[PDB]
Design a binder for this molecule. Structure first.
Ligand code: HCS
Ligand code: FE
Length: 186
């Protein structure tokens, strides 16, 4: 019985219930993420920015079944074109806006990766991606407003691939946490 999360802590409790089993009801997870109304005071602890690139801040390690983290995007900060390592990936905006650009999986032939579409993800909206849908790039294109997003991945993963937009060639990247549970982890 999906109820509206009252707070971030409540959302986390609800997520532990939704991931109690072996499968994932994507539409339910997306719905409860969207229903949480971002309250900056509840997540300030995790919103640790870096001047030069976006940061990944672990919030909850789940139940063996999911990571939950907050990403902090300075003005002009963005990601590579990347995959999600056979995991579900939910992205909910907590503050600001992000541009999501979708790409198809490249062919073996070296070729420019042409965007398939783009959209603007706005505060409180929750997007979903997985490798069957495609690849994406996420960017804070704002010149004046930092963005903060809440990401849930299931199963957890700590590596993915970055794709060269000019060729489609991929390289494996290991993702690192800037902080965990509010503690900076250099
Ligand atoms: N998956 C990316 C962020 C955009 S979804 C990352 O984990 O760093
Ligand atoms: Fe992503």
């Amino acid at each position: 019985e999906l109820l509206k999360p009252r707070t971030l802590a409540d959302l986390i409790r609800i997520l532990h219930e939704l991931f109690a089993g072996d499968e994932v009801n994507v539409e339910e997870v997306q719905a409860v993420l969207e229903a949480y109304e971002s309250n900056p005071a509840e997540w300030a602890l995790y919103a640790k920015f870096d001047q030069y690139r976006y940061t990944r801040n672990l919030v909850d390690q789940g139940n063996g079944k999911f990571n939950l983290m907050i990403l902090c995007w300075g003005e002009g900060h963005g990601s590579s074109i990347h995959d999600h390592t056979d995991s579900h990936c939910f992205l909910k905006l907590l503050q600001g806006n992000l541009k999501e650009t979708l790409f198809d999986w490249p062919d073996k032939k070296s070729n420019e990766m042409i965007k398939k579409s783009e959209r603007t993800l706005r505060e409180n909206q929750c997007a979903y991606i997985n490798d069957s849908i495609g690849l994406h790039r996420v960017e804070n294109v704002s010149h004046t407003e930092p963005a903060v997003s809440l990401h849930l991945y299931s199963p957890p993963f700590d590596t993915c691939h970055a794709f060269d937009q000019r060729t489609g060639h991929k390289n494996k990247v290991t993702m690192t946490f800037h902080s965990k549970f509010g503690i900076r982890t250099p």
